[PDB]
Amino acid sequence: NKSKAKFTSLAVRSLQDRSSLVRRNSVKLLSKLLLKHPFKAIHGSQLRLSEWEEYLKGSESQLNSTSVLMKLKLMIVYYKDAISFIKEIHKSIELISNLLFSKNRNEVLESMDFLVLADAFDIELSEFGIKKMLHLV
């Protein structure tokens, strides 16, 4: 699970690569990572930045107010990892939305598939991606 964040960061960085095939494969990797993630034990299949931030704030308040110490520590580090992953996915979504207008059709199709998958899970910036996709006519 730890290497998942590294793979996501490398894929987001490679999204800006000059080669088109590399970009399509990075989009595929991000789609595969978003389709199944370890972040499903609690409130699975729902990636909302506001809700996760509120949950993290609640956990921080609970810790501020024997097993309790490290249990809250693990919960907080898990929530921080979730927030970082959500931010990375949001940045990747923005990059792919900017990347929608490409000469190669396979890249466009994979970008549309990734945006649809990201829209399937409730995402605040998914509507922007759908709006950008609407101009593909």
Partner DNA sequence: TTTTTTTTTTTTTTTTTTTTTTTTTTTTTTTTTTTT
Stretch that binds DNA, among 3-11, 33-41, 51-59, 103-111 (CB under 7 A): 103-111
Return the residue of 71, 77, 104, 127 that touches DNA, per CB under 7 A: 104
Q: Which element (helix H / strand E) includes 25? A: helix 20-35
Return the residue of 20, 100, 128, 133 that touches DNA, per CB under 7 A: 20
Among all chains, which residue has been given the structure tokens 């290497």? 3
| Positions 30 through 49 that interact with DNA (CB under 7 A) | none
N residues, the chain: 137
- Give min distance, CB of 108 to DNA, in A: 11
The greatest distance separating any two alpha carbons of the chain, rounded to the nearest whole angstrom, comes to: 60
- Tell whether residue 135 is a contact of DNA (CB under 7 A): no
User: Which pair of tokens denotes residue 31?
Assistant: 């789609």
Asked if residues 92 and 127 have their Cβ atoms less than 8 Å apart, the reply is no
Return the residue of 2, 6, 36, 103 that touches DNA, per CB under 7 A: 103
- Give min distance, CB of 117 to DNA, in A: 22
Residues in contact with DNA, total (CB under 7 A)? 7
Q: State which amino acid sits at residue 135.
A: H
Among all chains, which residue has been given the structure tokens 């990347």? 99
- Give min distance, CB of 33 to DNA, in A: 24
Name the burial class of residue 28, with classes exposed (0-12), middle (13-18) and buried (19+) by CB atoms within 10 angstroms of its CB.
middle
Catalog residues that contact DNA under the rule CB under 7 A.
18-21, 103-105
